[PDB]
């Protein structure tokens, strides 16, 4: 409504979350361990195109799991809900089944878990080599960001692949259970998966991608239709219930917004018909979510009444 | 917007769902088995007070599990979110842990499962006898329905109590795990629980209760504040993710509205800032939800674009 | 072989286990908490009738779970293997399913877990009242002990019943799943169960009961046939794999003898065609087994080569 | 005792089991599918060296899972109980955890499951290449069989490796959880594993290997010490509780002998201080055990009273 006054509250919330110094920076690969715990950035892009940034918003970092809802949207956009959900489920697994790769029907629980993102990766642009598949997804992310920063980290790619024994275990398990479409080169799909995890954004460019999802699939800084209404609706439902790892249920109850976190410390946040946001702070909590970002999200809903069922 | 034209679409959807004759009427007690499979009613109450009914909308039936979100709302209204959630969790259990009474922290998964509703019943109006507790809840349901039909089935009460061995197993298990507030007479709480399950409504009176939840806790036919905004928001989040038994996840994805089903064939449905509805048809599917009601809900969201993340 | 020299090794092992002061005396009821941690007794009865005792062997204590294999033997003796195993399974549950009352077929895992012992109690001497059922089992235990000390603790009975909420949860759960024979008064079976748990023995009398199982069902101090060969064989197989709570698998691997522990600190031990033993020391470890008794059993197999697969 | 008369009962039991035509020959690789359902052989080797064969006892088939207890014995023989069980557990998993690769302590449940056999394979003769490791195990199996038929199927090896996606998923999962000794080439260990599964025996040569285990680790046809008493005792305990897949618990209760089945239809059976046996019939039941072999084992214990706890 009054954008100038709203940005002052964003700056206040940014400053309050800055004092929250807890957490541990992810250190399983040296490309994540490198990062300073003090980096903290918040970028907002409204559905009308209004922008606002505070902090470290032009420093590139990997999307990691923040790419999961984006490639799911691309798959539904090109293939439809029915085809995509023959290979992947549509609900959270719960704390009891959080270590199992598949559900009762031999399908990955949802697109937001590793097994589900690996199957979704196998459905995109079938029939062409990995170079063409990667270019096709980059072309799509550039439209979602309004041609803003979309890069690639080769160091992260080489490190994820050399140390991803758990993902290779998922790959061979999905192959044994017939989870992939026929004629899938599983090892090549894992390569394409590690490449998508290694795509780099800034808070500024990623907030535009979140504002595309908040604006019914239309990029707000170009006015271009990028995703179908069906792809956007399905991505937002699954971000609301499955996007914050084992904290998804607490986040749906207290925050009630579609969001997705990554191991780099990013939280892609969507406020439907209002704005898109990207919070980034490398230190993660026990659940794997950014400590500063989680604090910021709780304060944002309390102050601005953005929760789905807020009156 | 144009109420007259909207009711014609409700009548069309009612007629389309009427042809769906599948399902089985619940028969574990004779009071549920009695019911005709052909009974089918739909009542709408908007947040402005506009009413519309089609079918068997003045035939009383028991709320059964449809009372779970209502007593949860009363508990949060009187005690607050923090106190209530020391005893009960706030998320779905999943298909893996659908037979366990408690979660990792020795708490019932959420207020929408039997163990959770039993603990919530133990928190309401503590310190008084069951007659006063029952009157207090009836007084609250009468305000939610705008003084419309709220009755009681003694036959259902006596039958639920004489055959509820599973609920008695939950009661003793919660007592062993220290799930109740100190000085709780567990057997007396089970009695109060069977009584609340036996409360009778019509489609007409129950649609007013659903419209109270759709209107920020204000009854639309009286203008009286019945529930606090905090109680309404929490009830709607848990109805969205836990309200349709093992179908909750499919319903959140395809329908995306807060709803709650019961073994009598009722589906209490909320469309925030628009209306409240009660669908009722005794035959249930394998998941325990009304066959006609589930069909009606899917058609309603497709036609009127009421899904949470619909643009 | 040379009994005099063998008793000197028993006295040495007794003295070595005496130095092992770890553990905690069970304190859930005051009748168990009363007990001194320093009480330690070992009694041996060979299949030929040779006796030897060291320590506190004439102090009465409750059998508790040590009665589970004894009532199972009585059930198989009177009804046969086929009838008994229509109601109860015949294998360990494992660490994953150690909190579930039933297995995949809606049956208790084995007679050595609480749910299984409750179902076995429901099969003994059906058609008569609890006073006659109790007398019938006492008559049987007196034959197993060669008319040596078999008493009853009323204080333990009243305390087990007043605080056994977990057993009442099992009782109502088994009733819901149709686990009992038709026309079973479940509450009366729980009463009979608490009574059997409260039967008192000494190390001396209990070693005779273990020597009856070691001697093919013939009491070694009377020569009387008490149990059928089929009842003895089935009891010994289930004591070998299910008798030491969550330590059953480690005990089968390192000790390899049929044994059964109880919360009073007793370990009923059988060495087939050699002898029966009862070790008793109130302090229990994290698994619920007597610390001194477990130490003694490990030393006994190492020294005398009694393990099933020892050459 | 009277060998001539005993062989007549073996011939009678062979003839009775021959009429049991149920089951399905394993068909996941063409090398198993090839096999006739009518092949049925029984070979006996006593601890004194007495031999007897009936049926198809000189037709070679792969050991498959029948090699699991043999390589476990070799590992304990060379490294001891303590070192081996730092990497692998010592008990059955149960029906609830029959699809999980690891137990509560991030270790494979026991050496008789695929994950456990893969870890055991990683412990044998470390520091040398796969050709030397394979020769070392062949040298050991030749001593166990008294220099009787021990071959190799290259076709089975190439087929197991090309289609073993589940074993590759186990391999990468064990690598992620740090289950192998440091500096393990996991892919090379999987190769060595597929090679050991492809070793070929006849009923005659395999009954000598089972008689080595029945004779305290001394080969009965040569008198040579092959395995240590500790290796034999540990192998027999784990064959008794974990050797017949999901039927292990029913087999321990009804048969009570150490045994191990394989997908080729073989059942390696040990009667301690009496004899070793190998039953072979390609058609398997739902549990994966040979239909004729299971029938034969039940008849053998009933007739000759060989059950561990038989008087
Ligand atoms: C399907 O048949 C059984 C099955 O469901 N048996 C059950 N036995 N007891 C049950 N419920 C208890 C009541 C309280 N329960 C807990 C425990 C811990 C925490 N909260 N609650 C346990 S369910 C099964 C399926 C699959 C795998 C193994 C077993
Ligand atoms: C906590 O330590 C273990 C534990 O988690 N062990 C695991 N072993 N293997 C695992 N993952 C496999 C990969 C594919 N898996 C399936 C199976 C079936 C369906 N989908 N996926 C199985 S997890 C444990 C905890 C609690 C109780 C028992 C065991």
């Amino acid at each position: 409504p009054d954008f100038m006054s709203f940005t002052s509250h964003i700056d206040e919330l940014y400053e309050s979350a800055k004092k929250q110094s807890g957490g541990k920076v992810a250190d399983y690969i040296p490309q994540l361990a490198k990062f300073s715990p003090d980096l903290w950035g918040v970028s907002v892009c409204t559905v009308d195109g209004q922008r606002h940034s505070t902090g470290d918003t032009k420093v590139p970092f990997c999307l990691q799991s923040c790419v999961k809802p984006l490639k799911y949207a691309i798959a539904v956009n090109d293939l439809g809900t029915e085809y995509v959900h023959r290979y992947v489920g549509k609900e959270p697994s719960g704390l009891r089944f959080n270590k199992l790769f598949l559900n009762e029907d031999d399908k990955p629980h949802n697109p937001m878990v590793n097994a589900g993102a690996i199957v979704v990766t196998s459905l995109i642009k079938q029939g062409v080599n990995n170079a063409e598949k990667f270019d096709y997804v980059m072309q799509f992310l550039n439209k979602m960001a309004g041609n803003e920063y979309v890069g690639f980290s080769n160091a992260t790619f080489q490190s994820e692949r050399e140390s991803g024994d758990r993902n290779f275990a998922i790959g061979y398990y999905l192959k044994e259970k017939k989870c992939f479409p026929e004629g899938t080169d599983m090892v090549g799909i894992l390569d394409f998966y590690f490449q998508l995890c290694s795509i780099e954004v800034t808070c500024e460019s990623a907030s535009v991608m979140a504002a595309t999802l908040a604006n019914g699939g239309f990029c707000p800084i170009t006015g271009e239709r990028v995703l179908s209404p069906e792809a956007v609706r399905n991505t937002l439902s699954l971000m609301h219930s499955c996007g914050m790892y084992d904290f998804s249920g607490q986040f749906a109850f207290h925050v009630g917004l579609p969001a997705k976190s990554g191991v780099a410390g990013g939280i892609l946040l969507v406020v439907p018909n209002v704005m898109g946001m990207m919070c980034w702070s490398p230190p993660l909590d026990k659940m794997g979510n950014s400590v500063k970002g989680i604090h910021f999200c709780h304060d944002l809903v309390s102050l601005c009444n953005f929760h789905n069922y807020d009156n």
Side-chain angles (χ1 to χ4, degrees), chain A residues 194-209:
Chain A
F194 295 133
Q195 282 170 9
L196 296 179
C197 290
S198 303
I199 289 166
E200 280 192 335
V201 292
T202 61
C203 285
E204 298 184 356
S205 70
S207 69
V208 185
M209 301 181 177

Side-chain angles (χ1 to χ4, degrees), chain A residues 158-161 163-169:
Chain A
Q158 305 294 332
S159 274
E160 285 294 350
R161 175 215 257 175
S163 76
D165 302 298
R166 194 177 180 264
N167 287 326
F168 275 93

Side-chain angles (χ1 to χ4, degrees), chain A residues 99-104 106 109 166 169 173 177:
Chain A
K99 298 213 231 52
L100 307 187
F101 302 159
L102 303 182
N103 70 13
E104 306 248 316
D106 300 308
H109 305 276
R166 194 177 180 264
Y173 195 80
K177 299 296 176 175

Side-chain angles (χ1 to χ4, degrees), chain A residues 134-161 163-280:
Chain A
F134 187 80
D135 287 344
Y136 179 78
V137 171
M138 282 299 244
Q139 168 171 16
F140 235 119
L141 299 179
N142 281 319
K143 281 152 181 278
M144 284 190 232
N147 292 319
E148 295 201 351
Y149 192 95
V150 189
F152 180 70
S153 169
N154 186 45
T156 303
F157 168 56
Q158 305 294 332
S159 274
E160 285 294 350
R161 175 215 257 175
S163 76
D165 302 298
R166 194 177 180 264
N167 287 326
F168 275 93
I170 292 175
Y172 283 98
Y173 195 80
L174 297 178
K175 199 180 163 190
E176 169 71 26
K177 299 296 176 175
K178 309 291 187 201
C179 298
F180 294 118
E182 267 172 13
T184 287
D185 170 22
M186 185 275 299
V187 166
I189 288 304
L190 282 183
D191 250 24
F192 182 36
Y193 175 80
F194 295 133
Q195 282 170 9
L196 296 179
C197 290
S198 303
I199 289 166
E200 280 192 335
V201 292
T202 61
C203 285
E204 298 184 356
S205 70
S207 69
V208 185
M209 301 181 177
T212 296
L213 295 175
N215 199 30
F218 284 88
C219 176
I221 71 174
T222 60
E224 193 191 356
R225 186 196 294 270
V226 185
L227 295 162
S228 62
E230 168 191 338
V232 170
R233 194 187 83 157
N234 292 354
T235 308
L236 299 182
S237 307
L238 299 165
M239 275 171 75
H240 173 89
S241 67
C242 316
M244 309 294 293
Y245 305 118
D246 286 337
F247 201 64
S248 301
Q250 300 266 128
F251 196 89
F253 188 85
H254 293 286
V255 184
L257 287 176
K260 183 74 198 86
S261 64
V263 80
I267 302 177
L268 192 70
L269 180 80
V270 177
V271 188
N273 309 305
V274 181
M275 71 191 187
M277 273 190 39
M278 176 53 94
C279 304
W280 172 67

